[model samples]
Target chain A: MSHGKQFTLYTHKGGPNGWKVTIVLEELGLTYESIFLDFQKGEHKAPEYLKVNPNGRIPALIDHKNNDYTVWESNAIIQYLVDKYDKDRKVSVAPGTNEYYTQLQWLYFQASGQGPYYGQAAWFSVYHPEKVPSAIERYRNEIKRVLGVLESVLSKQEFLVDGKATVADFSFLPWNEGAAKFLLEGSQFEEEFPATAKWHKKLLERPAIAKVWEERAKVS
Target chain B: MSHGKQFTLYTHKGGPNGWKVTIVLEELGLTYESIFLDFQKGEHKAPEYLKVNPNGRIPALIDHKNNDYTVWESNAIIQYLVDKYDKDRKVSVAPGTNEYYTQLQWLYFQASGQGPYYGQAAWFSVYHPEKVPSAIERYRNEIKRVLGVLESVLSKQEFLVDGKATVADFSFLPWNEGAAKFLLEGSQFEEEFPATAKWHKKLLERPAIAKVWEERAKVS
Candidate 1:
């Protein structure tokens, strides 16, 4: 809202991480363009793209406003966006506040705990044709454990922090709705984990989140 | 140094995450106490510990000076410690600087990228006692890919973020030394990953890291 600048996000189609960044940009109503890469042709692994994100992953952001500064990792991008652009503290708490650190903890949890396990469960169940039943067991069981953690807190509060959604909650949304939900197929999801299901649905109903999903339908 | 805060860290023996927090605390020479939980007796899952970290994971911290404010997730805790306690910016870059966001990106990469894949490889190869060869293959291959990412960067610079070592560099040290090194047993390590190995060695040679390891010897 302060600068006459836009962002360029290097992303990949059909991946949860890409949309995670877009949702933040959209919610904040920031100016940006999205270049969905060709993962099939290994565009992400190219030397040029590697410089953007040495990890060779999707969802790298270039902030044209800041001398074209580039940042990678979905949560890191979200943190950067909020830390700088969320001037009103729209979706984040004040930095150095106890709530701020508490919020960051959940963001890290979603990045470290939920994303990897959900990806693995999806890999065994949907993609990466494999017969790793035990591996699937390990991740799926862990997913329930993760949801249980969410459910415990959600049952008492409406959100992960401060009674409203923050980057922490948004970071977990994509994985749960996409691959994580698919992995839980045939399980009594609503019956068993009512609070988590309700929380997930609440996050889904947000206007910006819905807009992101609509955009994803066109892109993916 | 602004406050007389002696932090209390709740950890578990034999886990890399707990030690990761300790190294940061030691490097800053902060006052703290360590409470290593008994995972076998289900101590971490108990209600009291869960209140400290609702996710029920180890390496949570209680800042005594800040009203016993609790923080979980190792990377989040590291960021908190450095942001608040590292008054001289010894192991961190300035907030809002390009290098600061760059430092955070790699920290997220370590937590999200290296930790999970290395953990899975360890689960299959050592701890969980499984027969999932393809699962092992998926993770072990990922470990190599992660190291290759580090190698591509370390091959160019001595550290991940700035020319000097930051918390980003320290975050990766534990996994590489423990399960990751064990997972790579029988492979030509130093030859294939010379830069990464050299960088790893550089991080290990630090006095604080040496002190942390000495403490781990008695705990684990």
Candidate 2:
């Protein structure tokens, strides 16, 4: 079922949050265009882009179908797209249902819990000009703790909610990639987080996720 | 309009996250019981609370009206409360409206953006065993940038969404309080963020907000 309108997604090359929106778009098979902001040239922080998102973050969307509506904040954008477009309950559950709130709970967990800790882990490990070993150590431990929290649940159930891969589950994948690439580099990922690793394997098997990964790669 | 059922909210007395939930609870005049987690006694990490919120965080809610459904994630809990209990649109717009999505967008920003940055700023300043000035500097800058983003919007408009103090705007109150109390203590808050300060004064005048602050105080 085509959504009948194209969406414009503003993104940044190699940014996890932007790829997050792409995964949902591809998963739902919606028609959408993407503009990768030139970070080196500060396109995201430009005046015109600021009108779209005052925070000037990547992964803002313009839903031409809905009065040219603009949505920012990656998880919020994904929720908007899913709510309006995912008609068949693919990758989401109906709102007001128990599973629906559960879906949002997990997504918020990923956004507030994983996003910050993992992002900071990367910042201190890869980007920060000064090496702060203590701070880096704190976040690395937090990364493991967050993964352990997921493992505690994933060990019993396959997906995060309603026994399926909803948007909540999808929300965690992009950051998990970074966890492996930067934050938890050199650690025994599969061994340390077996349930999460197994779960990641299942997500990678999804065509949409793999497609989004390639789309993410080709952007830069 | 009484909700006709009581919610059991798990909180920590000194915790801002828990207070975030309290604001919504009071704003809607919902009947809710409060249970302050014993952080000093390692109660939050106990097994029972983990069942309610595996992340071991404060501000999980049990809605007795909905088969004792539990909701974690402070922003998610507030949304669930607002969606289900605030039948009059007193603090929220209806779902599916453009304003509704905008409200959710800003709440997510509070969760993913301001929550993390402000929490870290507090962590570096107050809680961390080892002082990391660089990390503190990074987060302090983030807190200001976040307030600046708010200033850019609140300067023109009064609230974050719906031209009123929606849950999205209320979700930010506790953190902004922390910003002044600890994170950016001694800074010229009124001077730097006059728009946000003026907006905050209006929220303070709300009887519900004031009531919840007292409830927050008596919990410990």
Candidate 3:
């Protein structure tokens, strides 16, 4: 269990983006320290932490093993961890291979397509100062469209990239799981996107996901 | 002026994401065929095109040389092209290096942070069935915030990473240029984020970027 490597993860409470880093850490079984930020106190934007992540966002990682290399952008952190630590290729595909680029496709999709649209839905539904049904419906409808794209593929294949699970598959969990809760109305939503629901349920059963959720639950 | 390696780029008119692929292709000086999709005719969602890109989005690439390898997600496409072709490291960093991950961080930031929010601003401002000022304002403010992040970093460094122009810097051009056009009020907006403006102007002067924008102009 000793990769003889260590890193520090900067995270925040309750944001799905931060949990994405922890879930990857758990899956890889890498040794790391998680430092959660209190957004209420503007801790993430403080001068000291700004150097770690210029964007003032949660879920940045500093790899002490590699010259204290700092990488922000949650998906980038996942790629860095997998590239440097997953030597056995347990949870990642080797670089310079077809599957590796294929894996990246899904990762980018999750980052751009799924995460942002779902976040907008959450914002309109829960966080917007005032309700705007058109805006809410726009994002909610987009969530269904994105899920449909997933269903079209998931129904035909097992995981996103290859037939096997990879970081690309893991990347979707943090946001998709929470986003589905808010976007999907009820059982009918599951019925409509049965393939996506099934794919999600399968990933939720992973111990790493469960462990990450357990840690996340304790925060609030 | 041919590398003698040809790829196919699937794209559409007036979409910044599609232009992104062209900019990278031009930067790398790679030869490629551009296939334009007519969304008015639903060509993107056509059965044949869907095989190229399951997401039914433009800016997908098929590398016929690499065993007909296909990649979508604009940023992922850029990374794949650079990884496989940029053996000289002219436009990309060496993989597994700190600079490489730092580049990925900016790439993801563009994909998730800038692209989506700017896309929302566009949707609300131009394409939504009806305008909701709150939703439009939400994304517009988010765009300003994103610009501030870039401004802060650019003020201290010339490029996004390693102080050298890389794909990470190129990745921002398409969306950032278009987003600024829509989001920024006037010359004052440029003055407000002078660092970001300078960085963007420098990228805009690149021959590849100029060439790609000229092609985009012809299409419209």
Candidate 4:
């Protein structure tokens, strides 16, 4: 029941997106190689790596044995890996189905919502080292707004969407698991948004998540 | 034979993401108010509009009035509308089921792939009048990369993922249809990507598209 396809993930050790993909790999029990792209050493920006992803962003999957298919986006990597291999029971549900769309609803939730806002929040809170009051307030507000939305969604369920642990949760959890850490460094998670904090705690409890965080780069 | 619900779209004509939501409105054959957001006048950036979408982006929706639910994100809007309204016709293919996940596979396809690439392409080619070489090349090459992936997928099938028309195609077509006029300008669509071009042509011929574009804003 093996697809006999080798999945080569170009990753960064503690990166949120990379962590999600690697955790997903372990969860699916797929055989794969993890190639670390050291950004600090300029490995990701190298000319040869550009052939795979022009952006030089990490967490790209190079499906070499399958006509050299290269997937760069983190969520896309999860979807492709699950589709190509997890045929017996879905890690990411198969394409062309209802649970599939529900999975997508949450994927968009993260890709379009949480990822952008949280990244901005991190930019303002940690990396900038020089924070404009307006910009800091903007991102911090947006971060809370986004987490609030996720809290509302998770309030009724144990997972992000579809009442099941689908790829959407996997795609989101790794990033949030790391992001919540950053958010917590500023204030206690339980004090700010208890429901979202509870949801984050629940997601961390998953074995797949433990595998995901085990490999992520240093959190902001 | 319609579901007991309303599928209204908040949009601005000729805007890129706006067409995506409206076209889905047409595909579902659900009647809706256009509620043009007047992007050219900066109406979309206003406080009132931001309430619906804190991002203040166009192409948001209110699917069911009683539920008082509002969905933003062009990709998510289509998914929300189709899942709630297209239940009988099954644009998402027996939505809330396995095909829903597959539908999501395509939804994420556009969200993570086409939207970002094409949006950046528009950014460089249209918005960036200075036409900074690095910025231009950055977006231009990225567009080609994403288009190639679409072409590769299209080379194998008539539709995007399912091989049959679904909500995914509706979302993707309007997003990339102006590919030639915008990013693909002076480029040979047929010669470059016969499959993606063919798929675009097929989408252009749809009455759903024809009707929606009637209200779409004129692109520069």
Candidate 5:
């Protein structure tokens, strides 16, 4: 599928949301170019990039031949690519099926709940220079709370919905990595959440996720 | 098609979100049993409801025959009914088409942005016993900003998207109604945003929407 189809992923290196998009592309085995905007340098705000993503966000994608179709929002872009390319593929479930809403359940579970909580926790507790105790505690509690929700669900199953991997699992893995690496650094995952810890370890074994994370280290 | 299917909607009367679901059900030409949960009584938070919605929020749909398929979020439930029951019907698009994504675009647009912003604006601007200017102003500006985004789109197009009314329009109308009645008066919509003002007028003309508004009486 690599013939002359000039796909491009507008991304940032090491960012969790950014990693999710690239990992999907890599897993799909599609030919694509990766353009890393220097986010630390505010390159996302650069004029050239803004035209592709008005939100000034990373992890936008441009389909070269489809009238230069542009899609933003990490989950949306991943869905778009999968819809157009990955039908009958193992990783993406076709939309409109019962599996589709099952897929959506996990996507929204991650997007509306997991991503926001974890992002807020990371910002308030660790990244933000200013220290506000209530804000810090609020986010910390929320992060733990949302993690517990995930741990509860993961405890009963292997992947998010079905026993197999789908886009839902793919969408969530990146965020979980960052959350685990930062939020629960010293905490015992097995002691507190043996199931989630096991699920996290299983995600790492996927070759597509591993390969994309390495090459993703180069781009934003 | 209603062959003994007991359509029960677990909703709180008078809330805008609840109105959206109840209104959509009525508009669908389907009869439902409204198990009115007292918001003041906090019936929605009970353990039995949590099994229907882990989030413990209203309004949830209980399909008695299907062993109570729990769809919690307002937009998801609306889209679910339209896709599953109202196929080729007026209010919704098929689940996986380009039209579906465009419909979903507005759904998320409402969920992730509009509903929250307007809800906050309404809370601080009118509902709060004591007005906090900073909080009110923060939400007020955001509501206007979001309104501006919608107005720009509504100005160019007849409906929320693609000229015709879909579930997206039904889903958002309640929020826009709240914005007008609570934060900004109907006159405010007309004076500040003629396009949005005109758009609401058009939306109200739909028999389904009109039936909903009548059930949900709000005087701003």
Candidate 6:
């Protein structure tokens, strides 16, 4: 199903969002060029890259097929790829369907709910340049709560939206992986959120996810 | 154009996310039964509400038309409404167009970028127990940056995705309303980001937005 067009993905080695795009790309079996930006040298914020993504963020894509169209925002990029390329609906649903919107509901939850709080937890716990227990506590608790929500849903169903895993389910993997430590005091995810932990294990076992993580390891 | 199926919107009095869903409901000309949860009473955290939205967040919807389908996440709700109800494409783009993907990009930007940072800014500045200058500064600066991105885009065009207003544009107003004060010290939005301020004012002038804000004022 290749369009005979090249897609360029701008990413970073260790960034979770960037790896997210890679997982989708691999899952869809899309061949694309990957450009890893050097954050230490400020490549992501460079004027040229900013033209592709004014937000100056990683996980930007340029689709040579669609008039050199550019897309940023990892979740949006995921949706775009599935919309344009997932013709078989292998990893997504047909647009304008009840199932499709349900898929999007979970996708937005991951984007707005999971990513921000998890990012903050990681920031406060690992970065932030100084300690702020209250803020850290706030985000850590949020991460657990979000994970618990996932556990509740997954415990009832095999996947987030439908019985089949979609891009919505893939969207949470990168951020959840980063939030592993802060998910609990001792990071006992299996003990605390057994369903969520089990679901994560299932996702990690996918060839696309495993391949992307292996590639990211070499770059990081 | 009514589907003859009831739509129950689970919302809150002062929550921006809830108001976001209301704007779309009003725009779609859809009549929905509103159930406002009392946050002070822990109504949102109760088990009954959790069954509807495990995240215990407001702005959830139960669409009786679609087999009692339930959806949460304000952005996703907006998309669901436009996808299912806005058949004329009044407030949304047709699915599978470049314009539609562009719209999704901005929608996610508003969901992930504008909402989170603005929410954090409000949290540290108003709700937090202690005044953490650093945390406050971080989010306040982010709010400014997010607004600046809006300024740059609005300067080039009248709306976030296109010349016309969209769900993407409307998604920012509620959070932007909350972040007004911290935008630039007393919320000098007009002075610092003339274009963005102008766009926001234009959106506020819409009858739907105007009515929702007025209703929110009554409760808040």
- Candidate 3 or 4, higher DockQ? 3
> Which candidate should be chosen as best, given DockQ against the real structure?
3
Model 6 segments beyond 4 Å from truth?
A: A1-5, A181-187, B1-5, B181-184
* Model 6 lDDT, residue A123, Cα: 84
RMSD of 1: 2.8
Q: After superposition, how far is residue B85 of candidate 4 from its true place, in Å?
A: 2.5
CA lDDT of B2 in candidate 3? Answer: 37
The predicted structure with the larger TM-score, 1 or 5, is 1
Could you tell me how far off, in angstroms, the CA of residue B34 lies in candidate 5 after the best superposition? 2.9
Kindly list the per-residue Cα lDDT of model 1 for residues B47-66, writing each as its tens digit. Answer: 99998888888889989878
Residue lDDT tens for model 2, B1-220: 1444488989888878989998899898988877888888989899988999889988899988788899899998988988888878999998767787889899999999999889999899888998888888999999999999999999988788847779998888988987876677565678889899888768977999988887666763
TM-score of 1: 0.95
Candidate 4 or 1, higher DockQ: 1
- Tens-place lDDT digits, model 2, residues A77-145: 988988889978988998767787889899899999998889999899889989988888999999999
Task: Write the residue-wise lDDT of candidate 5 on B78-159 in tens digits.
Answer: 7667877787667776655555655665665666567766765776676666655755666788778777767767777887
Q: What's the C-alpha lDDT at position B208 in model 1? A: 97
Q: Give the poorly placed runs of model 3, Cα more than 4 Å off.
A: A1-5, B1-5
Residue A35 lDDT in model 2? 82
Highest lDDT among the candidates is held by which one? 2
RMSD after CA superposition, every candidate: 2.8, 2.8, 2.7, 6.9, 4.3, 2.5
Model 4 stretches with alpha carbons more than 4 Å out: A1-18, A21-106, A113-211, A217-220, B1-5, B40-42, B96-100, B128-130, B217-220
DockQ of prediction 3: 0.84
Alpha carbon RMSD to native, model 5: 4.3
* Model 1 bad stretches (over 4 Å): A1-5, B1-5
The CAPRI category of model 2 is high
Best by TM-score: 2
Tens-digit per-residue lDDT, A108-198, candidate 5: 6666566766765676676655655655565567667666766767777788766678778888778777767677655655567678778
